[model samples]
Target: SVPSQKTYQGSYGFRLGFLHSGTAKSVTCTYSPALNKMFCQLAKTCPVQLWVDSTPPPGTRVRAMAIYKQSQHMTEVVRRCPHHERCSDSDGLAPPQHLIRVEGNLRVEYLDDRNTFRHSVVVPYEPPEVGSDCTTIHYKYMCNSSCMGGMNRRPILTIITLEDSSGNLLGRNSFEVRVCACPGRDRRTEEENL
Candidate 1:
């Protein structure tokens, strides 16, 4: 049996900056006793580092899980965007709907050119035909880092809008955005040689 009131008792667990200490303690442990004991021993024997409310903590690296999720989510959004559009009929004496239909395909990719040691560049998705004489609209995605910075996944969103020639607002969509990372130099070299 473990202590009941300890702030953190898990063999391997993490708490957010905003997460209350008491709440963290309440989280249930899912590991078996053997596994828990092993982890506990390893943690004690190995050099352990802890950070409290830190942004991009030391030795914290960008993980693959976040990148995989971001890529999958972005692909799903891209596929769904095609089915959504702004279409309205002319009730009375109004122009045809064909003249006002805005068309664009939002696409995303990483900025392969701007490679930094720790931070990878994220390029926003830009759809073609977003800016035209009949409809002038601007859309882009912004990346937001968590309290732990890039060590934890960041929140990203795509902000878009549809408008008419007269600067009248037709519609707007602002929500989460997703995108896959581009091939890094290492991958590019491997592919080129193959």
Candidate 2:
């Protein structure tokens, strides 16, 4: 069976254990309950943890953002738009407008050799856990706009930027969020047909 938010209410995200950014540094791509790569959900703000393998360059900083490129498969899964009837999620997938917002801080932790808990030390831009290989970034994403239709979901992307103190681009990565409604979504209940 595919993953169901109805089954698990916890925050869901990519658990690849490394950056999607690539070569040996390939920025990439998980689940035990995984099948057909199911991503399913809804809530106020969904917080997700992503990892990057780096030596922690001087004043390293990670940018938590930013949008959504329209995909070939975004039409079938939309709840109900608050703005209008028959609304499409693509309307909010542009660069200028961000209906889905992700945010985080420079403060990050080091993933253990086991790739489980944070190491005893931290990463650069903080203290410099030089002994550590990758850093764990905690980010939260939310949706301002709504979807349309009934019992639907929209799978969207959150592109994350990894750069140095010089503001030079180091690597880029992304994670998908499914803004969804279990059965369906619509503002009016009493006024609509049941």
lDDT of each: 0.21, 0.33
Residue range 77-120, candidate 1, lDDT tens digits: 11111111122332232122111111132321122123321112
Those runs of model 1 whose alpha carbons end farther than 4 Å from true positions after fitting are 1-152, 182-194
- Residue-pair clashes per candidate: 0, 14
Q: How well does candidate 1 score on lDDT at residue 138?
A: 20
Q: Supply the TM-score for candidate 2.
A: 0.40
Candidate 1 backbone collisions, by pair: none
Clashes in candidate 2: how many? Answer: 14
- Output the number of the TM-score-best candidate: 2
For candidate 1, report its TM-score. Answer: 0.18
Tens-digit per-residue lDDT, 87-184, candidate 2: 34332322222233232443433222244221121223433256653345433222322354322243444444455677565555455444433211
